[PDB]
Amino acid sequence: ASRILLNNGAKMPILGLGTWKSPPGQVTEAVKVAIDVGYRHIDCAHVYQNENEVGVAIQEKLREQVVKREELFIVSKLWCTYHEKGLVKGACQKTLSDLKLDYLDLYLIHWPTGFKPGKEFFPLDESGNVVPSDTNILDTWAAMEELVDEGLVKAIGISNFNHLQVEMILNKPGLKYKPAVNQIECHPYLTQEKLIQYCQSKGIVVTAYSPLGSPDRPWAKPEDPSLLEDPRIKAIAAKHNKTTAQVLIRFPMQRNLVVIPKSVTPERIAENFKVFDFELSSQDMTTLLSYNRNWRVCALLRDTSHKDYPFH
Numbered sequence: 001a002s003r004i005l006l007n008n009g010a011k012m013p014i015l016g017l018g019t020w021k022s023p024p025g026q027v028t029e030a031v032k033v034a035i036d037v038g039y040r041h042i043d044c045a046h047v048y049q050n051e052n053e054v055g056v057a058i059q060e061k062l063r064e065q066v067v068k069r070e071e072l073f074i075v076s077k078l079w080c081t082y083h084e085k086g087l088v089k090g091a092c093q094k095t096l097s098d099l100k101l102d103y104l105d106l107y108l109i110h111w112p113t114g115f116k117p118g119k120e121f122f123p124l125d126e127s128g129n130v131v132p133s134d135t136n137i138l139d140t141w142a143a144m145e146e147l148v149d150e151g152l153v154k155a156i157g158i159s160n161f162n163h164l165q166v167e168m169i170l171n172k173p174g175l176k177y178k179p180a181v182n183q184i185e186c187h188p189y190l191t192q193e194k195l196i197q198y199c200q201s202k203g204i205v206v207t208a209y210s211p212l213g214s215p216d217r218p219w220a221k222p223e224d225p226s227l228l229e230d231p232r233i234k235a236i237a238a239k240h241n242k243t244t245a246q247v248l249i250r251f252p253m254q255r256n257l258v259v260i261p262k263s264v265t266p267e268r269i270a271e272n273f274k275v276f277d278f279e280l281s282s283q284d285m286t287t288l289l290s291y292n293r294n295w296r297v298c299a300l301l302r303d304t305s306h307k308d309y310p311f312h
């Protein structure tokens with residue numbers, strides 16, 4: 001099936017297009033191509049600094065009647081400098097204005113860590129420490145719930161939340177809406193079996209980010225493990241006459257995850273969508289899982305003192 005049922009009653013496409021690092025001058029066309037090819041889910045964020053350009057693409061394809069707004073599943077995220085109760089709606093509205101939408105299908109707390117509000121995404125003190133905010137995730141969550149009740153977003157969720165942090169939301173006094181989604185890093189070198197079982201058991205859908213290992217992340221090193229070039233994964237792909245990226249996308253799909261590979265390359269945007277015509281075997285799946293190295297690609301601030309750092 002192409003969509004998975006969320007705990008808010010809505011269906012979410014299990015394949016979406018990532019937009020982190022997609023240059024502002026390239027992402028409009030990337031998203032137009034993605035919609036032409038059949039993508040219906042776009043993963044966005046204010047912090048990606050390209051929501052205006054994404055929104056241009058969405059608007060043109062709505063205009064062209066290639067798609068209807070109800071068929072689209074548009075996701076964005078609340079950046080760390082806006083965890084304060086009084087700033088959340090403003091943040092959402094800015095995202096909505098840039099995307100040129102009147103609602104979001106899903107809005108996530110991007111990271112559990114709140115940062116000092118200001119123009120800066122990563123406000124630091126004179127020593128280079130990130131300056132935290134004194135807001136806790138449970139009041140942030142209340143503010144996310146208001147957005148549902150105001151009609152700005154159809155669903156709310158979390159991202160980069162660990163087991164204990166998800167549990168705190170679930171156990172919030174006066175919890176009104178459960179998180180629909182936890183969007184986390186997930187691929188064969190970081191399989192996250194425990195976290196995914198815990199979320200899925202609570203009816204929380206998991207989205208796998210960086211499914212190709214984010215080879216374009218700015219802090220990558222040439223020496224780094226490479227999923228795309230792992231000969232073992234190469235082998236499985238060849239067995240199925242698919243590419244290694246297609247296997248890497250199909251893999252979380254069969255774990256009942258949502259997955260959001262990023263590309264601005266039209267041929268890859270198309271290739272990445274052609275993952276509904278083959279099946280990995282249970283053995284292929286277990287073998288892929290066996291490659292876990294607990295290797296996390298996307299996380300800076302590893303030495304942060306932030307009380308809500310999720311990866312200790």
Ligand SMILES: NC(=O)c1ccc[n+]([C@@H]2O[C@H](COP(=O)([O-])OP(=O)(O)OC[C@H]3O[C@@H](n4cnc5c(N)ncnc54)[C@H](OP(=O)(O)O)[C@@H]3O)[C@@H](O)[C@H]2O)c1
Pocket residue numbers: 017018019020021043044110159160183184208209210211212213214215216228245246260261262263264265268269271272298
């Ligand atoms: N919640 C959060 O904190 C968080 C964190 C990280 C990521 N995410 C989301 O998840 C999305 C995906 O993760 P990601 O951007 O980190 O990386 P990713 O999707 O794992 O990999 C992106 C890299 O793969 C290349 N690529 C794409 N398709 C390919 C193919 N078929 N063959 C070979 N190379 C291919 C892309 O190149 P080209 O673009 O040049 O084609 C780009 O360099 C993000 O864009 C963002 O939407 C969320």
Ligand SMILES: O=C(O)Cc1nn(Cc2nc3cc(C(F)(F)F)ccc3s2)c(=O)c2ccccc12
Pocket residue numbers: 020045047048080110111113298299300301302304306308309310
């Ligand atoms: O965010 C994206 O989607 C991708 C993403 N990841 N990272 C790595 C990060 N490492 C963090 C560590 C913490 C911490 F928990 F330590 F405080 C908090 C927040 C972050 S962001 C970035 O630095 C970043 C910068 C601009 C746009 C996107 C990103």
